[PDB]
Amino acid sequence: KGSVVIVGRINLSGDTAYAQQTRGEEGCQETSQTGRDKNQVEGEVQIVSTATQTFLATSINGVLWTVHHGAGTRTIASPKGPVTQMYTNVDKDLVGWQAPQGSRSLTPCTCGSSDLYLVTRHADVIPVRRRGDSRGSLLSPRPISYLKGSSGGPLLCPAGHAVGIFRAAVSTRGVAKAVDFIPVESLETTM
Numbered sequence: 350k351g352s353v354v355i356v357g358r359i360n361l362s363g364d365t366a367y368a369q370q371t372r373g374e375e376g377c378q379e380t381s382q383t384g385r386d387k388n389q390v391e392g393e394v395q396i397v398s399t400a401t402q403t404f405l406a407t408s409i410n411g412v413l414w415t416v417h418h419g420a421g422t423r424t425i426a427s428p429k430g431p432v433t434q435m436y437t438n439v440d441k442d443l444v445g446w447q448a449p450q451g452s453r454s455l456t457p458c459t460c461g462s463s464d465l466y467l468v469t470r471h472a473d474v475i476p477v478r479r480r481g482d483s484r485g486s487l488l489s490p491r492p493i494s495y496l497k498g499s500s501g502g503p504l505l506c507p508a509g510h511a512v513g514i515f516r517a518a519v520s521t522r523g524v525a526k527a528v529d530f531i532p533v534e535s536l537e538t539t540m
């Protein structure tokens with residue numbers, strides 16, 4: 350298997366949630382084999398890719414987190430070569446690396462607000478209501494197909510801080526009315 354490769358980012362930039370592709374497929378190939386990636390990186394939310402899967406990853410207090418069902422145990426390519434996972438937990442569906450060169454990191458949420466916001470791979474910011482340890486309800490139902498490819502992306506509080514990592518969708522006949530995520534407290538405990 351190859352290294353995970355950053356192929357873009359989801360910009361909250363200044364005002365607009367928009368997606369920025371920074372690498373093509375072809376280049377994704379050679380880079381996964383070497384794990385050496387000089388391509389420029391920015392921001393908190395990365396679009397990450399394997400040979401078969403595209404999903405997201407989020408930097409929180411110096412660690413780049415994503416889902417195990419996306420990354421597995423792979424390294425992630427960097428300018429100084431392939432980066433080995435700092436944290437792994439198959440049961441939680443969680444993996445972490447040292448935040449990449451060029452990135453910014455999110456702050457853990459400390460305000461306890463139930464008003465959350467899920468960022469998707471499509472660069473949509475979707476309102477969510479905290480409804481338990483690892484669960485939050487959507488204000489608007491959406492088909493799964495819409496959310497697919499967004500695991501590893503962040504759930505944010507109204508202050509912009511990180512509340513969790515998107516893990517799975519709670520679906521009924523293919524309609525998602527809630528989301529399952531890894532809470533930051535769970536990250537802090539994994540560390």
Ligand SMILES: C=C[C@@H]1C[C@]1(NC(=O)[C@@H]1C[C@@H]2CN1C(=O)[C@H](C(C)(C)C)NC(=O)O[C@@H]1C[C@H]1CCCCCc1nc3ccc(OC)cc3nc1O2)C(=O)NS(=O)(=O)C1CC1
Nearest residue numbers: 402403404417418419439442496497498499500516517518
């Ligand atoms: C947008 C949709 C959603 C965020 C996404 N997550 C999934 O699709 C997960 C993967 C797998 C099935 N998923 C689901 O969401 C299902 C599904 C019916 C398919 C919607 N929903 C579901 O279980 O409801 C259950 C009540 C909750 C409680 C149980 C959830 C279990 C969570 C889970 N843990 C592990 C630990 C270790 C593993 O080793 C290989 C593998 C795992 N796989 C898991 O779920 C996503 O976008 N992925 S992705 O980006 O396209 C892909 C590129 C990476």
Ligand SMILES: [Zn+2]
Nearest residue numbers: 458459460506
């Ligand atoms: Zn907060």
